[PDB]
RNA sequence: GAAAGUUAUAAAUGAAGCGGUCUGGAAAGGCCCGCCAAAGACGGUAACAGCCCGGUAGUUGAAAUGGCUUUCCCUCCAGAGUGGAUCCUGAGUACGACGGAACACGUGAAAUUCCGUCGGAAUCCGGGAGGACCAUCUCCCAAGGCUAAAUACUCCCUAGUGACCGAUAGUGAACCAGUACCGUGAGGGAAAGGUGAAAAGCACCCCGGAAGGGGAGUGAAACAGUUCCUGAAACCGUGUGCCUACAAGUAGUUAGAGCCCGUUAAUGGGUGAUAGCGUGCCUUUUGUAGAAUGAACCGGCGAGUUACGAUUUGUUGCAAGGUUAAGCGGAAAAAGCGGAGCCGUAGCGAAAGCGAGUCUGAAUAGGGCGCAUAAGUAACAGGUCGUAGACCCGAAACCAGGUGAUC
RNA sequence: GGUUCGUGGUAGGAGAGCGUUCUAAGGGCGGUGAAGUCAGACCGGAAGGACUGGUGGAGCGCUUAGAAGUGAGAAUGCCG
């Protein structure tokens, strides 16, 4: 049978025009009284997977 | 020539065969090692696992909808409309007539990229402002279909 | 298609029970005994090809010696002055000369002992 | 190009074969390729075997696990007992597969090309007899010199060609549709008529 | 219910070499000559047969019974338009509340279908659906029933096929096999093929109660004689060439006298008084001769495979393009047809959308991702991964249907 | 074909090969004796391959490709 893709990945990642994958800071939820507004600013823009969890993750999301 | 025939060089090659004696190197452990959970037989985890440890998917937030109504489009740039004769009414019935488009999903959009020489009148669903200006420029005339 | 084990594995074993030819009782009649002490002969014979050359170069000293002896020298003296004079000969030679011809022997004694003295 | 030939054997005239089709430089690599899988789609593949989740018995546990002495064992039908199931073996398979059409074109032009390289294609007027005789095939067959395996590709002929050519042993007609790379490739000759080679052309 | 044709269930006919010669127990084999073929499939015959036998291609054949097709007989039958007063168009039904289930859909914003229990419509000026619901529009008439083919399977019968097995294999069972045997019972469940072409299966004599032998005879062979083709290894013996009763040994290896032989003929073979060196194999370990584990010995059997997907490398064809799937056709072929679909050729954004740019932003700023700076696709082979028992053997345990108070 | 530098090795990576059963084509030997089995002092760098002789009494190699039920000394392994 034809291999499944995992559906909670691909809720969340990304594929741009080089195959690499985007994603979304971690880090932004409910506790914005703890957090300077140098980290909120910074943590509401996009990310790369790094190289690293890139190639334990290729496979689940292989067709989109 | 059946008793002669010779595969191309490099388009084959022997299958490796493990546990067949030590002297190839693939023998007793058959390349896996000493007594581990992946030196079991179908022992191996999941994908993503990472041994108890968070995932990183469970870890950044989900992001977007997907719209029902979304429309896509089929491209079509300014130098491929260049292989036209000058004064051809370019339609999108000519456009899978040659078989340059192969499926038009929601219809045709031509952009602005290349440059185009031919005095032609081109129909089609949507335009890109350079794309229209570009031909008015060489005397064109763009009517939306 | 099948592939029944036949032919080969008789082939290849009775091979090596015939390298155990002349072994004492079960070596040289089953294969397990047989295996381990073929291969143990193969390692026995490996580094016996270096003590060989070890244990004549004992024996071509000690005959040296023994002769060197009898003309008033000792072998570390004898084999200071051949060096020393020139003479080049080794001791499978040298022994020799010693056992067969000594009274060569006494010829390479005389030029060793002149040597030593200016 | 080549020398035309009447069924009685004397010279006729002279024919020319498209160099499109007859005359290009054989592809030996592409040949080699439609060979290996045009013989390995015609095997049938019915071969199985008996796991131990098949052979008849099983179930018990031969012996209790501990305390006898003997070696722990769950079956009587595993893989290292005597009359134990198989532990992979082999299974009903098909063996078919295809290359791109283009390739497949390539390889019978290539084929059908080096045979006239080797001067190894005769060019006939007509084969046709009146009643099935195979005494007058082998008569047919030595006033062109063959002597060997053939391929005899008729297109209009009659149905006493291949009656009278089916008990001869390296002899096969085929109705010049039928061509294909096995079949040139495994005779020796190739002795195909002049209304054959038109349809031969018009095809590819 | 008749007739005609076809088919299944027994069958008939059917070409061509006693050809010569050699070896041989025996010719189908070697050498040298002929012939048949719509028949050179298969099997047998004293070794390998197109021309010796049964047959094969082709052509014929059915008293009787079953099947099929057609026709006859037989049987049964109203279908068009115009009006629309008035009448009919499936009731405890459709729906709704409560509790469940099926829908890919876990109560969720939950349409749709079904079940149990309560409440409970309109009926053509009517009713339902279009994923809560309302209005418009579009499509359609529930609460009655029937319906062939395209699809799934094989205890069976006929004809065949296999880069399937060949007696520890292949069905548990090639042999009086679900038998012998085991259990109270449900139930579990084997081992076991081969004389020879032909029994021509040893008349007769001798030892012996017999069994079993030695001659004779049959046979090509009896060292093929009733587990009988071939007959390996462990294991058990008889004869003999070299050594051995003052010696401390993982049994060998290196040096070596003496004695005895004579080869795939070459710095050859067997045995060895004496001298040096030397603590088995595997596994698991920081580390094993290990007083840690496994193996009495010999033989056979016994462990990374296949299908479908992903990715990468190699090879081939075409190339801004590449390629068909199911299917029709056919010989369990090869073409041909089939462009539906898929990947690539353009990206950015959650999305509307814009587009070599786009998003964020008040911004023409900066920055992120892209283009500039373009090679893909189809098929096969190698490596690895995913779903499958997935590399082989091994639990204590859990659940479901049954059999047991002869102890 | 030369010059220089190298050539201990467990887990492990890479490469080249030997041998078994079956298939296709070419070419072969065999009752003047096939496979198997027994012995030998031969050949190759290894896995391995010939030759001669005894037994046996009917099938079997070689070359180039292809496909695998593909090679055992150990599992208190199964059977004899
Ligand atoms: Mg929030
Ligand atoms: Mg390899
Ligand atoms: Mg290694
Ligand atoms: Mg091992
Ligand atoms: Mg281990
Ligand atoms: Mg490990
Ligand atoms: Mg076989
Ligand atoms: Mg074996
Ligand atoms: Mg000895
Ligand atoms: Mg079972
Ligand atoms: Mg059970
Ligand atoms: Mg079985
Ligand atoms: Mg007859
Ligand atoms: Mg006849
Ligand atoms: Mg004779
Ligand atoms: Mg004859
Ligand atoms: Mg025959
Ligand atoms: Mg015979
Ligand atoms: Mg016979
Ligand atoms: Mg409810
Ligand atoms: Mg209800
Ligand atoms: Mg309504
Ligand atoms: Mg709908
Ligand atoms: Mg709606
Ligand atoms: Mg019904
Ligand atoms: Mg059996
Ligand atoms: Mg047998
Ligand atoms: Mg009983
Ligand atoms: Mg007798
Ligand atoms: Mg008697
Ligand atoms: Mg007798
Ligand atoms: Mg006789
Ligand atoms: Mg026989
Ligand atoms: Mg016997
Ligand atoms: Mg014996
Ligand atoms: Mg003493
Ligand atoms: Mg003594
Ligand atoms: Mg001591
Ligand atoms: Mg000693
Ligand atoms: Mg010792
Ligand atoms: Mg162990
Ligand atoms: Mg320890
Ligand atoms: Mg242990
Ligand atoms: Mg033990
Ligand atoms: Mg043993
Ligand atoms: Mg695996
Ligand atoms: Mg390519
Ligand atoms: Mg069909
Ligand atoms: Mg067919
Ligand atoms: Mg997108
Ligand atoms: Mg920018
Ligand atoms: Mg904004
Ligand atoms: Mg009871
Ligand atoms: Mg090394
Ligand atoms: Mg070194
Ligand atoms: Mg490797
Ligand atoms: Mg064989
Ligand atoms: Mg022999
Ligand atoms: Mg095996
Ligand atoms: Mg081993
Ligand atoms: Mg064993």
């Known amino acids: 049978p034809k291999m499944k893709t995992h559906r909670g990945s691909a809720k969340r990642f990304k594929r741009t025009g080089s195959g690499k994958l985007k994603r979304r800071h971690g880090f932004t939820s409910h506790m914005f009284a703890n957090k300077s507004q140098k980290q909120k600013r910074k943590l509401r823009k996009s990310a790369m997977v790094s190289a690293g969890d890139f190639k334990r993750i290729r496979q689940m999301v292989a067709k989109m | 020539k059946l008793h002669e025939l010779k595969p191309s060089e490099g388009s084959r090659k022997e299958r490796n065969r493990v546990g067949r004696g030590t002297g190839s190197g693939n023998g007793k452990t058959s390349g896996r090692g000493h007594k581990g959970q992946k030196a079991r037989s179908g022992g ?14 469970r870890r950044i937030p989900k992001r977007g909808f997907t719209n029902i109504n979304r429309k896509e489009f089929a491209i079509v740039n300014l130098d491929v409309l260049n292989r036209f004769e000058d004064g051809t009414e370019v339609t999108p019935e000519l456009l899978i007539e040659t078989g340059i488009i192969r499926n038009e999903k929601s219809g045709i959009k031509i952009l602005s990229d290349g440059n185009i020489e031919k005095k032609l009148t081109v129909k089609a669903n ?11 420029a060489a005397g064109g ?4 279909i | 298609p099948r592939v029944k084990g036949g032919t080969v594995t008789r082939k290849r074993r009775k091979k090596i029970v015939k390298l155990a030819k002349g072994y004492y009782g079960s070596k040289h009649l089953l294969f397990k005994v047989a295996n381990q002490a073929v291969m143990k002969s ?4 490996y580094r016996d090809r270096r003590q060989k050359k070890r244990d004549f170069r004992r024996l071509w000293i000690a005959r040296i010696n023994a002769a060197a002896r009898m003309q008033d020298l000792s072998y570390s003296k004898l084999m200071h002055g051949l060096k020393l004079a020139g003479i080049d000969i080794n001791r499978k030679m040298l022994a020799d000369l010693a056992v067969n011809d000594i009274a060569s022997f006494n010829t390479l004694a005389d030029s060793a002992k002149k040597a030593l003295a200016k | 190009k080549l020398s035309l030939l009447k069924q009685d054997g004397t010279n006729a005239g002279e024919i020319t074969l498209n160099d499109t089709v007859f005359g290009i430089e054989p592809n030996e690599k592409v040949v080699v390729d439609v060979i290996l899988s045009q013989r390995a789609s015609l095997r049938q593949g019915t071969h199985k075997v008996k796991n131990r989740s098949e052979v008849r018995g099983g179930g018990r546990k031969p012996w209790r696990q501990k305390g006898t002495g003997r070696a722990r064992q769950g079956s009587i039908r595993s893989p290292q007992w005597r009359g134990g199931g198989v532990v992979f073996g082999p299974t009903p398979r098909s063996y078919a597969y295809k290359l791109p059409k283009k390739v497949r074109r390539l390889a019978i032009k290539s084929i059908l090309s080096s045979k006239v390289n080797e001067e190894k294609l005769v060019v006939l007027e007509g084969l046709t007899f009146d009643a099935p005789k195979t005494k007058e095939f082998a008569a047919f067959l030595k006033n062109i010199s063959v002597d060997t395996k053939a391929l005899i590709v008729v297109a209009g002929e009659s149905e ?15 109705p010049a549709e039928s061509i294909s790379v096995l079949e040139v490739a495994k005779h020796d000759k190739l002795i195909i008529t002049k209304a ?9």
């Open chain 4, 160 to 174: 006493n060609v291949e009656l009278s050519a089916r008990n001869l042993q390296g002899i096969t007609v085929i």
């Open chain 4, 196 to 204: 054959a080679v038109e349809k031969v052309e018009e095809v590819l």
């Open chain 2, 44 to 57: 191996g985890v999941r994908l993503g696992f990472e041994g108890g440890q968070l995932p990183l998917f």
């Open chain 2, 141 to 144: 005339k763009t009517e939306v």
């Open chain 2, 126 to 136: 949507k335009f890109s402002a350079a794309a229209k200006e570009a031909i008015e």
């Open chain 3, 42 to 45: 193969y390692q026995y014979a």
